[PDB]
Design a protein around this ligand. Structure first.
Ligand SMILES: *[C@@H]1O[C@H](CO)[C@@H](O)[C@H](O)[C@H]1NC(C)=O
Ligand SMILES: *[C@@H]1O[C@H](CO)[C@@H](O)[C@H](O)[C@H]1NC(C)=O
Ligand SMILES: *[C@@H]1O[C@H](CO)[C@@H](O)[C@H](O)[C@H]1NC(C)=O
Lengths: 221, 221, 221
């Protein structure tokens, strides 16, 4: 019958209280002869009926795609609860199940450092801001830029990369224009990792004197 | 017959991911003729079975006390979903039902400040550290002190007090010995309020009353 | 069967000469059949005819209530003179005598330390100062605020909180226009308590009480 996948929740959703995390069981390549799609979610051997069933979606190759969204709770996912998606279908001869949980590795606290642009790139119209996040295990991590408490969109982030000690490390290149950088604006890097206390951290990068790299102080003594 | 209370979960438990939030409903004044009690837990009317009942405690007034604890979800409680501990017992002509939820309102974020001890304080055996938490809403915060990631215990916190502009504020004195203070220990105060980003903030305090304020700024370049 | 309540004066009144401490005796449950009441007092067994009685009041319970007020010189209350409230009511099988005097406990002098506001608040248009009080027994104390001999009213005080050593401690944040604090206006926190010398003390504040005078500045490069 139709293939059934599994989607883990975004680690940013799982590590943030304000965000709702979801465990997703998607079905792909479903024919029109079998529109009946059923799910049975078992958490640690306990069936849960709280799942929400999204509408089916038709692709260009005339296949349905029914999305099974289950609202997961952060304490559950972080503590090691197994989530079983038992789907019984007409086109499937037998029920299909897939097991998903969290990575049961040894947590390692990320170290976050922010680096100002070097003077080489101070000639262009847009400077690059670097957020080094090294020494964290595992790769379930997310990073974004915030300026004066509001989100920043013009940035990218390299995927985590294996290191010498077996941990991971990744970067985040924030492209702001030269003027806003040169006004002394405060840019902050936000990193959410399971090993971090409160699953959050922040580093600030001022223009001249907050981080001493170029020095000119009107000291108030 | 018996009577039923309702304990909201601690704000420290609710606003911290690693902690376990729970709604405790307490039944006291239970006679010997009806010692067995049934707990039906509802979250917006939906029954749950994950509540862990507790052994009876025989009170000195010739009665019992049986308590059932439901571990709530952080998203569920902090959103404002209702919680009803329905207690069924033979003695009660009508089973007791009470409902508790998060205090609805406009959550104004706190503005944490920290105040180093006055100069007159450093002439005593122990100093006191002030962590002002002003202008928040509502009055559900637990404040704890930390030192280099270690917990602090010798501190007290004033109950939240009203503020002229309708908000709240509160205080916390950290009693530490003067010697550790005078070395240059990095003491920090930890707040957890629902209106913050990640519902957590930490304010640093060190020997200097700010960088350009105290005895000398030994510039090293 | 009337009941004779008795209430001490507010401690703020008793500690300070200008305000008037008073003996507030209440006769409650005064039936309408025998509503006429006679008031008597003893000062260590001596009748005094210098008191005044507030007029009769009506309540929602179809009963009567009266309150009488006797002027007390602060010395008599301070050294524990005995005040007894006698009521000669016609609905009484016997006169009721209630004895009130100074609530004698051990005294410990409050140690008033005032703390300047932190620079983090200095960005706001309002600034909150602090007058910590600690190590005093018992918890009956009034803290006021003044500047240039003129009292301020934009202040709030937290209720006393028990300390580790059995004493108490409390705080008093007062908010001012930032500019008013910026020219180094003085701000004295008055503390009135029995254990203090003269039942009164004060500690001042100034833009330069957090900014010292010694500056051993060093430039090592
Ligand atoms: C340093 O900053 C001061 C701020 O008053 C400014 O006037 C001065 O030109 C600056 N000097 C530099 C950038 O060399
Ligand atoms: C000034 O700073 C230096 C840094 O080397 C320190 O040794 C010295 O004690 C400071 N001065 C005072 C008066 O504390
Ligand atoms: C002031 O700083 C100088 C330079 O470091 C040092 O030699 C001197 O002892 C300091 N004065 C003090 C600590 O009183």
């Amino acid at each position: 019958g139709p293939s059934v996948f599994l989607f883990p929740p975004k680690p940013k959703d799982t590590l943030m209280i304000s965000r709702t995390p979801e465990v997703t069981c998607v079905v792909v390549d479903v024919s029109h002869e079998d529109p009946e799609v059923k799910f049975n979610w078992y958490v640690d051997g306990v069936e849960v009926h709280n799942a929400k069933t999204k509408p089916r979606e038709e692709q260009y190759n005339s296949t349905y795609r029914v999305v099974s969204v289950l609202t997961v709770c952060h304490q559950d996912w972080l503590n090691g609860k197994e989530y079983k998606c038992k789907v019984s279908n007409k086109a499937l001869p037998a029920p299909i199940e897939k097991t998903i949980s969290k990575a049961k590795g040894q947590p390692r606290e990320p170290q976050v450092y922010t680096l100002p642009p070097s003077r080489d790139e101070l000639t262009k119209n847009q400077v690059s801001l670097t957020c080094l996040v090294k020494g964290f295990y595992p790769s379930d991590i997310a990073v974004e830029w915030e300026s004066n408490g509001q989100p920043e969109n013009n940035y990218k982030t390299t995927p985590p990369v294996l290191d010498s000690d077996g941990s991971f490390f990744l970067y985040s290149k924030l492209t702001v224009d030269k003027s806003r950088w040169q006004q002394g604006n405060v840019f902050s890097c936000s990193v959410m990792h399971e090993a971090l206390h409160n699953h959050y951290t922040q580093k600030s990068l001022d223009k001249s004197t907050g981080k001493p790299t170029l020095y000119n102080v009107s000291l108030i003594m």
